[model samples]
Target: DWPSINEFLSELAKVMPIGDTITAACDLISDGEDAAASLFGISETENDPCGDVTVLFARGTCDPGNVGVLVGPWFFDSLQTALGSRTLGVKGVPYPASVQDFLSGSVQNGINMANQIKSVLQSCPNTKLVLGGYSQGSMVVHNAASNLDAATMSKISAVVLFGDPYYGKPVANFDAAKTLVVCHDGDNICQGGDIILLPHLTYAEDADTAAAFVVPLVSHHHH
Candidate 1:
């Protein structure tokens, strides 16, 4: 009885789009291509549950896709490219990603993330775990991780938070070197402010560095 969130929802990736669900604010990715837009939701667990490395990511609030346009896809693509020969998979946490959820501390989304991480570990024996989130999504990671047992937390290889609202806070029991918080100088959110400035939207620029941080940690294992 391991049922929680199943792969049946993977079919909805085709249906996920920047429709009315995204208002004027979500259109902030002005100079981007449609490729990131089309993949509004992704569930690599459905396609490749047991890869060499799996990144479990939660998107920011009010974002269009399950992976979100601002950071998740860019970061995942970077991580995959850096891995080269190693297989990489991504499971975007399924949640409303609403402003209300963000303000209320993301309780439901956090439980979902923790359960998802547990499922991946149970199903894939040797797969390395990388946890990540952007904006409100980062708090979801924080919430989920805090509830996890120390053994489960130790199993995680790396953690990344971009434009984190809870900037200085550590991710559960994970090591500091293993965790990367990519907060810019002027990101108000990182300073615990509620304003979304241009600094918050440019985490796509740190994609390469973020992947670099995880690459070394996950590369030591051999098949």
Candidate 2:
């Protein structure tokens, strides 16, 4: 049994401090740095060793560095295992504030993340980009993709979203063929009904499947 999204958000609000975006931002930045250090065993300022293809991943709500440590690496490692170590993984480090900020700040975060992606594309013209996210993170990627220019969008090889709340919504400025949305059965988050936390948390198992879809796209680009 799972609590509906309404119930989950209600409980979440009680625990999360609202209207304190500054502290929340600082906390997320620290967490993001810590996650990066733990994952790469070096400072984020260091140049990434694997830069042939970059995966920019955004984590879900209340996930303090979860994407950098868990989801991003899980997906990146799977890609490395299959496609070799030509992949660089970067996590979108946004302020994971309360649920309201999660929704409200998504667009701004997406815009900022999109700018970063554009910079990457500018610096590495040959690099292929994969945009990936889970839960609220998925919404961030959707918004980022929507804001990207046609030239920037052309560099992206694929978009992978898990437990996306805006599952059925039309994604502007993105190719439907290049996007893969994965939602487990009964997962109300993607179903556009309820917001069950369990299904939202169960995306760990789906990373390999997502990588399978992305590999072909990367391969096609290489050839």
Candidate 3:
């Protein structure tokens, strides 16, 4: 269930520096800012989104606003709220996320994504990591994970895929319990179909649930 704005904001207040706006936006609580011309329309290439708790996310195909308004920011905000009192950093993988990327099952971007994941793992050894994707971004996750060895995979705290196009596939051998896929019951994309049904676009509705899944696992790897 999605939290009301007040509750969500209240929870987030406990966590400082939730995240930064890309070229223009990250949490887009809209004022007069959205009217601006590409001044800050979501490009995170320069952002180093690693923190004590960091999430490496991939946006879906042709989805606007670096992380996509469809599911990214919502799930990201929800995650921060659920992770109350903890600092959360976000990185949107810079892949084309194009139609062809999906049609050809191309992971050129995914290999890049995998490299970023590993970069964080080694560079921020103490940070708890969460990997996520939306729609075609799920393809990125799978492709990226396939490139990562088990030891590196095991270090990840959690993985969440919303509207997954590769629904039943394991997240590249990730621990079953640590992976959460929030595909809607009727989502054709989740069934591995190419149709971008309305159900497939509704992943924003599941942000709270997806965040709930990632919360506990943020600390899952302790000995």
lDDT of 2 by residue, 71-147 (tens): 45456666766677565555454545236645464788778778877877777777677888877778888888889
Q: How close is candidate 1 to the true structure, as a TM-score?
A: 0.79
Q: Count steric clashes of candidate 1.
A: 0
| Worst lDDT 10-window in candidate 3 | 29-38
Deviation of model 3 at 143, angstroms: 0.8
Off by over 4 Å in 2: 1-50, 66-70, 95-98, 192-194, 220-223
lDDT of 3: 0.72
* Candidate order, lDDT descending: 1, 3, 2
lDDT of each: 0.74, 0.63, 0.72
Candidates in order, TM-scores: namely 0.79, 0.71, 0.78
lDDT of 2: 0.63
Model 1 steric clash pairs: none
Give the number of the best model, judged by TM-score. 1
Q: Sorted by TM-score, highest first, which candidate order results?
A: 1, 3, 2
Give the least accurate 10-residue stretch of model 2, judged by summed lDDT: 41-50
Total backbone collisions for each predicted model: 0, 1, 3
